[PDB]
Paper text:
Thalidomide and its analogs pomalidomide and lenalidomide (IMiDs, immunomodulatory drugs) are molecular glues that bind cereblon (CRBN), the substrate receptor of the CRL4CRBN E3 ubiquitin ligase, altering its substrate specificity to recognize protein neosubstrates that are ubiquitinated and subsequently degraded. IMiD-bound CRBN recognizes a small β-turn motif often found in zinc-finger (ZF) transcription factors. In this study, we developed a phage-assisted continuous evolution system (PACE) to reprogram molecular glue complexes and applied the system to evolve a small, 36-residue ZF domain that engages IMiD-bound human CRBN. Finally, we obtained cryo-electron microscopy (cryo-EM) structures of the evolved zinc finger in complex with CRBN and bumped as well as canonical IMiD derivatives revealing an expanded interface of evolved interactions bridging the CRBN N-terminal and C-terminal domains.
Author numbering:
A (entry chain A): 2 to 392, 710 to 744, 748 to 768, 781 to 980, 984 to 1013, 1024 to 1113, 1122 to 1140
B (entry chain C): 17 to 49
C (entry chain B): 77 to 211, 220 to 406, 410 to 427
Write the structure that this text describes.
């Protein structure tokens, strides 16, 4: 199988941000790390001014800055999710900018299981070593001498397997490590002293202490204080040897504190963000002992205000804060000395678009010029919205609740959107005004104390004004899974059909579910038909004028009788749960979460499904799709794409061999046919917000482009010197296979950027002998599609 | 007269042979009796 | 990867890893085989016979002997052994020595251990909270709300990812097992999905072909899901030969003493019966008189039981003089589970 993958919209989620003097020792820099993309901005009075934006062959994962003695500017340490560590330096020669690679290496332990708490990276404040926690019970150390040009590392065997969080401590005679670890007794903070000469731990400066049962964040306070600060949900505790100061303010009780930052160089002020987007300031008050040293007196916390759900917080000088978010738009908030009348000190200066997470998407030609636009359901919680993408121009429509699915009715000129909002049980009370609660007309379906329930709505949204025309609230304790718009049977009306599952917390697998049929006309959404089923309706498709439903582990076919009632025609008990259902012609693709693809065909004359092929390869999927009659494309675990191909013996005719793999580097929620401007064009969304595009090449072009790639990989220089075939190798957390049948579109499209002298050596002896002009024309032709 | 497999009891043979033959097993007598 | 292992022929039962298999051995050939194997590696291999012709085996398990004894009574070399299944192997070829020595070239299958569902989409910021104190309904409702908090980023809800989680799926099996024993201490069962699934598979009344199906599923989560599927949907047991005469329902299944609901026992003549203990039974006629003899359960006399339609031996009725006064033991081979 031959395929072509191009990224039509670079990832926009923010993995993490750092601040420091990277570009120059005289100016401030802010480094954002979106998935695989590193953006270096220069901070100024007006705001961020982009200076560089590079793309690494890896997920940034860990990023840090450090200025070892003897350097003018700060070096940048990046460890990727594939364990490619690299120390980089920024070198501005005249008007030309290029990131130099001081050192690189692959710090991976062969035998081990990745820590369930996640990769942790930390740097000694004196910059003597780099500490990495990758695997339980092992603490990897990288000395930072000038001889480690390959990042040689050695492991220290920790005894406390479960380590929640770890930091280095400011102020000591040897690099000290303080960490919170959980054992059956509870959570304890413990300190070790790292010794390079012996390559092991020694008893720390102060013994272990017991802490809050959830104590799950460690902050290393700088001089003159020293010591550490431990944060949970319930209490904040400052430990420094004998000194112990605990404060349990009621204002942080409601939400977990998930990110932190140091505002002032002396640690007097810290910024804390919680899951629901609130921003607090943690104050440290100091006393001066007569003929002694400064000591901490008390800890105070006050609610600065409300921002976007905070994934990373950094403090740009002059009271600016860059709130990054993976669930919503990032922003630059301004901290005032006094609160506005609403009672909050935080105001918003600028907002940065974040398309991800893309939970569903659909291609629609609103203006009918033959080049369709795209609509995506982005964000979660209060950040949810609809993004309208066209040729790359993006428009936003906030909802203030999580959108889940989407479909388009051409005749009604409206979008159907499933949405979910969280309501407290204190009847239930809404938290904030939402799209579903502020609809022009509302309908309600009929047929503990602080617990948070989910209320689900179907929203009819006009396609031009994007105002919520209608909102239909579903039954209590009902969860809507699927949304398909289609016309069934000979019926001339067009319907919004919804699948829902009745989920009670006491149960495990839903027993009851519904298939509802709504008709939107004359400004009203009336329920036309309703079917009770014994299961959850995970997926639904329009199968040649019939409704294909996935009732638990079953594919059922409903015909639309003249009396307007769904009527069963055939069933196929197919063992697995038919979560992913796709159709083309007569072939049906069925899959569950753990791979297990299964291709059926609906025998028309007989009237019952017959299994045609199946492939059971236990591995998590994100979504599947059909490229053509014979090729199916899906996403496996660890951010991978894969292609199966239906085909001699019967066994060979019933085995969907994999004929292509690719480490896309993102989670692919949804695939959808359509192009925004090679046969076919399957767009796909992602969690990071990247929108990609897959097309089917011809054999000749596929060979040509594969050879051109293999040639480029010997010319183009990647940041940190990461072999391209390594970054595109398949990955399953203990296994790797080379990519096959997939042409990396970004690498090819980068051919245009390189200048003529490199062009000539890239094109030499390729495949009449081709010349730079012919390859330029071919690459232009490839660029046209996206 | 005992059935070597299940413990069925009888006073004559014919019932015993019928009962043993009714068993749906490999009846590896040479490895059991 | 690849190895050669010997097979004793008299053992006809699909052994599941972790299950305890007791045997008596009579004929000289197996006596020599066991006395040669005991000194060497105890790698007894038992083939799951797909064909009752004893000449077609695809999957099997490498049993391990852990108890050995000899009883030279009756003037002859009776020997009694107890082994346990360890690993699952694929039959490459059957290189019989032609002496009845069924030497098999096989390969040891692995266990495909997958990572947690939400290990790819995990939010790195809140990843520190993934660790949480271990300690009930509210506790599970909090476990689901904490571990799959990132389910918002993907197109499926939390409760759909809780159907594939090892721990939440273990808990349901634990509940439905405790409903059978009434004295199953939480700590008796293992603590990891592989061992737990293998142990549960060894107590269900799966007849022959739904075991070779379980025995050939590599993924532990797959085995847990399939076991819970069997345990929920199928609740009635019928005669294997008749296939249509109900003898009992799962709710009457009753464990006795320390062993689970179903346990392996050996009759006086060396045959192996996986007996399942139940309070009540129906459609069975009793023959004989209550006689103790070699009663498996001390203090109980037994009478042979066979279904009143095809007269095939189904089990025994155990009674005692004295708790419970009357119960039944049904051999697993003769029982076929069926969907109500
Ligand atoms: N005395 C005999 C004699 C022949 C066969 C059997 C027994 C016998 O006791 N059992 C079972 C049934 C009774 C029991 O519980 N233990 C057994 O070994 C037999 O199959
Ligand atoms: Zn018998
Ligand atoms: Zn019968």
């Amino acid at each position: 199988s031959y395929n072509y993958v191009v990224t039509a919209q670079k990832p926009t989620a923010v993995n993490g941000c750092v601040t420091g003097h990277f570009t120059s020792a005289e100016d401030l820099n802010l480094l954002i790390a979106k998935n695989t993309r590193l953006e270096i901005y220069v901070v100024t009075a007006e705001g961020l001014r982009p200076v560089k934006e590079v793309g690494m062959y890896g997920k940034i994962a860990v990023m840090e800055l450090f200025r070892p003695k003897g350097e003018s500017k700060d070096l940048l340490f990046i460890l990727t999710a594939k364990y490619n560590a690299c120390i980089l330096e920024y070198k501005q020669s005249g008007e030309s900018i290029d990131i130099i690679t001081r050192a690189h290496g692959n710090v991976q332990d062969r035998i081990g299981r990745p820590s369930e708490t996640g990769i942790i990276g930390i740097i000694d404040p004196e910059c003597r070593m780099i500490g990495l926690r990758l695997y339980d019970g092992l603490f990897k150390v990288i000395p930072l001498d000038r001889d480690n040009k390959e990042l040689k590392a050695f492991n220290i065997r920790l005894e406390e397997l479960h380590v929640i969080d770890v930091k280095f401590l400011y102020g000591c005679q040897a690099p000290t490590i303080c960490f919170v670890y959980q054992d059956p007794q509870g959570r304890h903070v413990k300190t070790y002293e790292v010794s390079l000469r012996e390559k092991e731990f020694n008893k720390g400066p102060w013994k272990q202490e017991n802490v809050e049962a959830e104590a799950s964040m460690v902050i290393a306070v700088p001089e003159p204080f020293g010591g550490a600060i431990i944060i949970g949900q319930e209490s904040i505790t400052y430990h420094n040897g004998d000194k112990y100061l605990a404060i349990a303010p009621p204002i942080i009780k409601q939400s977990t504190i998930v990110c932190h930052n140091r505002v002032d160089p002396n640690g007097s002020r810290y910024l804390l963000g919680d899951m629901e987007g609130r921003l607090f300031m943690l104050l440290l008050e100091k006393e001066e002992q007569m003929d002694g040293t400064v000591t901490l007196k008390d800890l105070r916390v006050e609610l600065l205000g409300e921002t976007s759900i905070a994934e990373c917080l950094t403090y740009l000088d002059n009271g600016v804060v860059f709130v990054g978010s993976r669930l919503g738009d990032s922003q630059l908030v301004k901290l005032n000395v006094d609160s506005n009348e609403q009672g909050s000190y935080v105001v918003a200066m600028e907002t940065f678009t974040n398309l991800g997470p893309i939970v569903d998407m659909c291609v629609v030609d609103l203006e009918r010029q033959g080049q369709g636009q795209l609509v995506t359901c982005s964000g979660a919680f209060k950040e949810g919205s609809l993004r309208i993408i066209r040729n790359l121009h993006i428009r936003t429509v906030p909802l203030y609740e999580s959108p889940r699915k989407i479909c388009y009715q051409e005749v009604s000129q409206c979008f159907g959107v499933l949405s979910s909002r969280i309501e407290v049980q204190d009847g239930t009370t809404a938290l904030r005004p939402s799209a579903s609660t502020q609809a022009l007309s509302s309908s309600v379906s009929s047929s503990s104390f602080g617990e948070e329930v989910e209320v689900h709505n179907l929203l009819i949204i006009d396609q031009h004004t994007f105002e919520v025309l209608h909102a239909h609230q579903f039954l209590q304790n009902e969860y809507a899974l699927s949304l398909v718009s289609c016309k069934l049977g000979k019926d001339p009306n067009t319907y919004f059909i919804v699948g829902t599952a009745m989920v009670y917390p006491e149960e495990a697998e839903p027993k009851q579910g519904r298939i509802v049929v709504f008709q939107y006309s004359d400004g009203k959404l009336q329920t036309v038909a309703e079917k009770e089923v014994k299961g959850a309706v995970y997926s639904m498709v329009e199968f040649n004028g019939k409704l294909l439903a996935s009732i638990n582990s079953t594919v059922r076919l409903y015909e639309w009788t003249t009396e307007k009632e769904l009527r069963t025609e055939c069933n196929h008990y197919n063992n697995i749960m038919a979560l992913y259902l796709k159709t083309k012609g007569d072939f049906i693709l069925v899959g569950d979460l753990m791979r297990s693809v299964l291709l059926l065909a609906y025998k028309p004359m007989e009237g019952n499904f017959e299994e045609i092929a199946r492939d059971f390869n236990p591995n998590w999927m994100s979504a599947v799709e059909i490229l053509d009659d014979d090729n199916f494309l899906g996403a496996e675990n660890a951010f991978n794409l894969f292609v199966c191909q239906k085909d001699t013996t019967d066994e060979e005719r019933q085995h969907l061999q994999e004929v292509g793999l690719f480490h896309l580097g993102e989670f692919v929620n949804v695939f959808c046919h359509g192009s925004l401007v090679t046969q076919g064009s399957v767009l796909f969304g992602t969690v990071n917000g990247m929108i990609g595009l897959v097309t089917s090449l011809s054999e000749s072009w596929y060979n040509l482009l594969l050879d051109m790639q293999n040639r480029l990989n010997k010319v183009i220089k990647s940041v940190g010197k990461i072999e391209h075939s390594f970054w595109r190798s398949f990955h399953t957390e203990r296994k790797t296979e080379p990519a096959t049948g997939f042409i990396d579109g970004d690498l090819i499209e980068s051919f245009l950027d390189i200048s003529r002298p490199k062009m000539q050596e890239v094109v030499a002896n390729l495949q009449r002998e081709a010349t730079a002009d012919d390859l330029i024309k071919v690459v232009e032709e490839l660029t046209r599609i996206h | 007269l005992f059935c070597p497999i299940c413990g069925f009891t009888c006073r004559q043979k014919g019932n015993l042979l019928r009962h043993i033959n009714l068993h749906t097993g490999e009846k590896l007598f040479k490895y059991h009796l | 990867s690849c190895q050669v292992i010997p097979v004793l022929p008299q053992v006809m039962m699909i052994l599941i890893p972790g299950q305890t298999l007791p045997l008596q051995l009579f004929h000289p050939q197996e006596v020599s085989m066991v006395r040669n194997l005991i000194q060497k590696d105890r790698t007894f291999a038992v083939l799951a016979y797909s064909n009752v012709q004893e000449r077609e085996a695809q999957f099997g398990t490498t049993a391990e002997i852990y108890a050995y004894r000899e009883e030279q009574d009756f003037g002859i070399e009776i020997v009694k052994v107890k082994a346990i299944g360890r690993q699952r192997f694929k039959v490459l070829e059957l290189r019989t020595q032609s002496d009845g020595i069924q030497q098999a070239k096989v390969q040891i299958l692995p266990e495909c251990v997958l990572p947690s569902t939400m290990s790819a989409v995990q939010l790195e910021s809140l990843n520190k909270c993934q660790i949480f104190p271990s300690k009930s309904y509210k506790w599970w409702q909090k476990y689901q709300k904490r571990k799959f908090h990132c389910a918002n980023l993907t197109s499926w809800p939390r409760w759909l990812y809780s159907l594939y989680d090892a721990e939440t799926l273990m808990d349901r099996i634990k509940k439905q097992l405790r409903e059978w024993d009434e004295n199953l201490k939480d700590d008796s069962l293992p603590s990891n999905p592989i061992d737990f699934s293998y142990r549960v598979a060894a107590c269900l009344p799966i007849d022959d072909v739904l075991r070779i199906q379980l025995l050939k599923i590599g993924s532990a989560i797959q085995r847990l899901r399939c076991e819970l599927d069997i345990m929920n949907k199928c609740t009635s047991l019928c005669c294997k030969q008749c296939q249509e005469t109900e003898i009992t329902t799962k709710n009457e299944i009753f464990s006795l003493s320390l062993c689970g609901p179903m346990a392996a026992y050996v009759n006086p003549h060396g045959y192996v019966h996986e007996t399942l203990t139940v309070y009540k039974a129906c459609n069975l006629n009793l023959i004989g008189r209550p006689s103790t003899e070699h009663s498996w359960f001390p203090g109980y006399a037994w009478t042979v039981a066979q279904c009143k339609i095809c007269a095939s031996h189904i089990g025994w009725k155990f009674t005692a003089t004295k708790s419970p006064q009357k119960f039944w033991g049904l051999t697993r081979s003769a029982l076929l589970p069926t969907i109500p």
